[PDB]
Design a protein around this ligand. Structure first.
Ligand SMILES: [Mg+2]
Lengths: 49, 49, 200, 209, 236, 215
RNA sequence: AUACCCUCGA
C-alpha cells in the first residue's frame, strides 16, 4: 500500500506477507525529475498513484 | 463500432469550408490519427553564414 | 545557408520564401552598406547593434536589399542544371525556406524532410546571370528534352482534372451562358455544378 | 481592443468597368472574412435590373428555326442576356423591338428605361419581339422561377479576391486583400464596393455601438 | 493554431555546457566573478562565485559561468541562437582543491534530502512498531508487556544505529573528491531547458511511414469544420 | 432590405448558448454566419493568467515538496482557468494553502472585480507536508500571445485569451407572414463562460462595422 | 579546429 506520494518520490508500505521479520515497510522510489538524455531531450517521471 | 457511436458507417461526412463556409460537394475522411513529432526540428537545421 | 523546405502556394514562379534570420545573416554586408549610405548608422558597431537588435527600421532596408536580388536554391544531389535555379526572395516568418510547388518536380524534391542550400550572388554579373540564365521562369523546358518540366504536379493536376470532368446529370445542366463571366457568376452563386454539361 | 483599420484604400482602374481594390494592413483572418463577405454580397445580393422573358414572333419553341437573321434563337437570347438596363421609373416594364443589323439602340424607349450600352448588337438581318424587364437581387436562373431566360440582376459581372501577406515593421505577418471587380458599366466598381459595404453594414447596424 | 495553443507538440530540450579549469602554464585559472572588462548587467545575472543562479532566463551571448585564465577570460557563454532557462548546475573539484560555496550549498541540500528520507523511513517503521505493541497489550501478563517493550526499544535502537551508519556512509561518499583529468582543477557544467514549440519546418509523421514537414499554421477559422462546428486539427 | 432586430439569445448552459437572428434577407444567412464565426473565433477579448510565481520555485522545470504534480503540470492546469475581469485589466491574485487537500479555483483569493467561472478546476493535489503559496498575475488580451512575444523566480505563461471554443451556424427559413423567401441565422456558440453571448455578438457587430467603415 | 568510428535525413 502506497504510504506517501509527491511529485518527487513514492513511499510504499510493503505488505507484511511479502516481507521479512524486521523492517517491514521500506520501499522508497525516487522519481528522476527533468534530466538531460543522450539526445538532449527531457527525462522526467510522474506519479500515477 | 462507428454505427454504435452514432457516426457515419462509411467513416466520412461532408465538411464545411473554413473561409467560404460552403459544404464540399463530396464527403471527405476525418478522424483521429496518432501523429508523431520527430527529432528533426528546423530550429537545429537553420544555418546561415 | 540551408534549412528544411516548405511548399508555398501563394508564391509566384519567379520568387521563393526566405526566413527573416537567414536573409538577415546572408545579406549582412548589403544591410551594412545601405545603412551607411542612408546615414542611419555612422560606425559599423552601430550597424551591427541595429541588425542584432532587429530594430524596426532594419526590416525596411532588408526589404530594399532583397527587392531585386535573386538567390540560388539547390538540393543535395544536383543531377542536372535544373537542380539549382535562381529565385527572387520574399521575406517570410519562420525558419523554413518556402518553395514554389511547380519547381519541386525539377528539383526532385518532396516536402518529407528535404533541405535546400541558399547562396547569394554578389557581383552585378552574378545577379544578371541569375536573372537572365537561371531564373526559375527561364528554365521551364527540360534541357534533356523540349518537354516542359515546370508542369502541374499531383495536387494541382487533381484539381484541374476534377474541374474539367462531366456528369451525366448535374445541377445547372442545360442552360446557355453568354460568357465565361456568366459561367463564373452562376457557379459561385451555387446555381450550377462544377461539372455540368452546359452551353457557353 | 484596437484593431488595424486601414484607411489607405486604393482602386487601381485597369479598365472602364474593371478595377482592382487593395487593402494592405489587415489582421490575420480579416482578409478572408471581408473578401468572402463582399464577394457573396456583390454576386448574390445586389439590386439591379435585367430582362427575364422574351417573345420573338414566329418562334413558338426555344429550339425553333427562324429565317431572316444570320444567327439562331439561342444566340439571340445570349445577346439579350448581356444588356445593361437601369429602371428608374418602375420595377416592371415591357419593351418591344421591331426591325426587318439589329442593335440595342434600336429598342424604343420611354423616360423610365435607360439602356447603358446602346451599341450591344442583338441580331444581323438579311424581328418583331417584345421583352420583359424586371428588378431582382442576383443571378436568378430560368429554371428556378424563349419565354424564359436566365436573369443576371446583380450589377457586377465577375468578382474575385485574393489575400497576400503584408509586411508591417515589427508585426511582419498580416494579410492584404486584393479584390477585383467588373460591372456591366451601370455602376462604377468603386460605387459597387461602397454599395456592398453599406448593405453589409446595414445587416448588423442594430447592435453595433 | 489550436495544436499550438493547446501546446500539444511542444517538447522540452535539455542541453549542457561545460567549463574546465586547466592548469595553465602561468597559473591555474580561477572560477571568479571579477571577469576583467565585464559589464554590470551581465555580472548581475551572475552570482558572487561566478555561476548563473539556477532558474534564470538566458538570452544569446549571456555569460553563464565566469573563468579567468592568466587575466584573460575563459568564461562560458551560450552559443548563438541558443536561449533557455538554467535548471541545474554541477560542480566538480579536483582532490586537494578548495570546495567553493556553490558546491557546499549543493552538498548541504543533498544531505538534507537524504537525512529527511531516512528520517521519514524511520518514522513510518517506528510508528508501525509502536502501534503494533500498543495493540498487543490491553487498554491503558505483566512480564510479557515489559519483555515486548524491551524488544521494541532494542529494535528501535538497532534501526537508529543502522540508519545513522547509512547516513554517515552517504555523507562520506559525498565528501570525496573527483578523479578529474590531469590539469583539471574545477569542472563546472550548466543545464539549459528549452520549450521547443512546433513551427513550420518541423518534421511530423504518423505510424505508417507517412512523413511530412509542417507547412503553415492557419487559425482555427480556416480549417474545415464539421456541420456541428468542430474544426479539424490537421489536413493531410 | 429587411434587417434583424432584437437579437435573440438562448442559454443552454453556462458555456453553450444559441443566438438566433430572425429577419434576414435571402442568401444573407451564410454570409452573416461565416463572418460572425470568423470574427468570434479570431478576435474576442478575454483574460487569462499570464504570470505566476511561487515561493518555493525557481523555474518551471522543478517540483515542490508535498505537491503531487510538478510545476509544468501546475502551470498547464492554470492555463485552463476561466476568469472574468470587470474593472481594470491587469490584476494579481494569490493562492496559499498548506496541508493535505486539493487546490481548486475556489481556493484562489477572491476580489471585487475578479470572478471565477470554473471553480471546480483542480490545479494540484497536496500531501500532509505539501504547502504552496503562489501569486497569479492575469491580463486581458485578444489572441494567442506566447511567452516570447510578451528577475529570477517569475514564470512566464503562454496565454490564449480567446474565450470562445466552438462556433456553429445553420440557416433556416423565417416566416414573418410577409413571404417565404426570408430566412434566419442560428449561431450555436460555445464559450468558456467568461463572456456573455449577446456581448460577443455585439462586439463582433462593431468589429465588422469598423472593418467595413475602412471603405 | 585535424583524422577516423558510430548513428541519422533526403
Ligand atoms: Mg523526400
Amino acid at each position: 500500500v502506497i504510504d506517501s506520494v509527491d511529485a518527487s518520490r513514492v513511499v510504499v508500505r510493503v505488505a507484511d506477507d511479502e516481507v521479512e521479520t524486521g523492517e517491514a515497510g521500506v520501499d522508497i522510489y525516487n522519481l528522476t525529475k527533468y534530466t538531460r538524455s543522450n539526445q538532449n531531450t527531457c527525462i522526467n517521471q510522474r506519479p500515477l498513484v | 463500432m462507428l454505427k454504435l457511436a452514432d457516426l457515419p458507417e462509411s467513416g466520412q461526412m461532408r465538411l464545411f469550408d473554413g473561409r467560404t463556409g460552403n459544404q464540399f460537394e463530396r464527403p471527405t475522411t476525418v478522424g483521429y490519427m496518432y501523429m508523431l513529432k520527430l527529432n528533426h526540428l528546423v530550429d537545429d537545421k537553420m544555418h546561415a553564414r | 545557408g540551408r534549412s528544411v523546405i516548405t511548399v508555398g502556394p501563394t508564391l509566384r514562379l519567379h520568387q521563393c520564401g526566405l526566413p527573416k534570420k537567414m536573409a538577415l545573416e546572408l545579406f549582412k554586408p548589403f544591410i551594412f552598406g545601405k545603412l551607411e549610405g542612408r546615414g542611419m548608422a555612422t560606425t559599423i558597431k552601430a550597424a551591427k547593434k541595429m541588425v542584432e537588435r532587429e530594430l524596426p527600421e532594419v526590416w525596411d532596408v532588408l526589404a530594399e536589399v532583397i527587392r531585386e536580388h535573386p538567390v540560388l536554391l539547390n538540393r543535395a544531389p544536383t543531377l542536372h542544371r535544373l537542380g539549382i535555379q535562381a529565385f527572387e526572395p520574399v521575406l517570410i516568418e519562420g525558419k523554413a525556406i518556402q518553395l514554389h510547388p511547380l519547381v519541386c518536380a525539377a528539383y526532385n524534391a518532396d516536402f518529407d524532410g528535404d533541405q535546400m542550400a541558399v547562396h547569394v550572388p554578389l557581383t552585378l554579373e552574378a545577379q544578371l546571370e541569375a536573372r537572365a540564365l537561371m531564373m526559375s521562369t527561364n528554365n521551364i523546358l527540360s534541357p534533356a528534352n523540349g518537354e516542359p518540366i515546370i508542369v502541374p504536379s499531383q495536387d494541382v493536376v487533381m484539381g484541374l482534372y476534377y474541374m474539367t470532368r462531366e456528369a451525366i446529370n448535374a445541377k445547372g445542366e442545360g442552360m446557355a451562358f453568354a460568357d465565361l463571366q456568366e459561367v463564373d457568376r452562376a457557379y459561385r452563386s451555387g446555381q450550377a455544378s462544377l461539372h455540368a454539361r452546359v452551353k457557353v | 481592443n484596437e484593431f488595424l483599420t486601414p484607411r489607405h484604400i486604393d482602386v487601381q482602374v485597369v479598365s472602364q468597368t474593371r478595377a482592382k481594390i487593395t487593402l494592405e494592413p489587415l489582421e490575420r483572418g480579416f482578409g478572408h472574412t471581408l473578401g468572402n463577405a463582399l464577394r457573396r454580397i456583390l454576386l448574390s445580393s445586389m439590386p439591379g435590373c435585367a430582362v427575364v422573358e422574351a417573345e420573338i414572333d414566329g418562334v413558338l419553341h426555344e429550339y425553333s428555326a427562324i429565317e431572316g437573321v444570320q444567327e439562331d434563337v439561342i444566340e439571340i437570347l445570349l445577346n439579350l442576356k448581356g444588356l445593361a438596363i437601369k429602371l428608374h421609373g418602375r420595377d416592371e416594364v415591357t419593351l418591344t423591338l421591331a426591325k426587318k443589323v439589329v442593335t440595342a439602340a434600336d429598342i424604343q424607349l420611354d423616360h423610365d428605361v435607360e439602356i447603358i450600352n446602346g451599341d450591344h448588337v442583338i441580331a444581323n438581318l438579311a424581328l418583331n419581339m417584345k421583352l420583359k424587364v424586371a428588378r431582382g437581387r442576383g443571378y436568378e436562373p430560368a429554371d428556378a422561377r424563349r419565354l424564359q431566360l436566365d436573369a443576371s440582376f446583380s450589377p457586377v459581372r465577375r468578382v474575385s479576391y485574393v489575400v497576400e501577406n503584408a509586411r508591417v515593421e515589427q508585426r511582419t505577418n498580416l494579410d492584404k486583400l486584393v479584390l477585383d471587380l467588373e460591372t456591366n458599366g451601370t455602376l462604377d466598381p468603386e460605387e459597387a464596393i461602397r454599395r456592398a459595404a453599406t448593405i453589409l453594414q446595414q445587416q448588423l447596424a442594430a447592435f453595433v455601438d | 493554431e489550436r495544436v499550438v495553443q493547446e501546446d500539444r507538440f511542444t517538447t522540452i530540450h535539455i542541453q549542457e555546457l561545460t567549463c574546465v579549469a586547466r592548469d595553465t602554464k602561468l597559473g591555474p585559472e580561477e572560477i571568479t566573478a571579477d571577469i576583467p572588462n565585464v559589464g554590470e548587467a551581465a555580472l548581475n545575472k551572475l552570482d558572487e562565485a561566478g555561476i548563473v543562479y539556477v532558474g534564470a532566463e538566458v538570452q544569446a551571448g549571456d555569460i553563464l559561468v565566469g573563468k579567468v585564465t592568466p587575466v584573460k577570460d575563459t568564461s562560458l557563454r551560450v552559443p548563438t541562437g541558443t536561449k533557455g532557462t538554467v535548471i541545474d548546475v554541477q560542480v566538480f573539484t579536483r582532490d586537494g582543491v578548495e570546495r567553493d560555496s556553490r558546491a557546499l550549498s549543493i552538498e548541504k541540500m543533498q544531505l538534507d534530502q537524504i537525512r529527511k528520507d531516512l528520517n521519514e523511513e524511520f518514522r513510518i517503521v517506528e510508528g508501525a512498531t509502536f502501534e503494533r505493541l500498543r495493540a498487543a497489550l490491553v487498554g491503558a501478563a505483566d512480564d510479557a508487556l515489559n519483555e515486548q517493550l524491551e524488544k521494541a526499544q532494542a529494535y528501535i535502537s538497532d534501526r537508529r544505529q543502522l540508519l545513522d551508519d547509512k547516513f554517515e556512509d552517504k555523507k562520506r561518499k559525498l565528501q570525496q573528491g573527483d578523479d578529474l583529468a590531469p590539469g583539471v582543477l574545477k569542472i563546472v557544467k550548466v543545464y539549459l531547458a528549452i520549450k521547443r514549440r512546433i513551427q513550420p519546418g518541423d518534421k511530423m509523421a504518423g505510424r505508417h511511414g507517412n512523413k511530412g514537414v509542417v507547412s503553415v499554421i492557419m487559425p482555427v477559422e480556416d480549417m474545415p469544420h464539421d456541420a456541428n462546428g468542430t474544426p479539424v486539427d490537421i489536413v493531410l
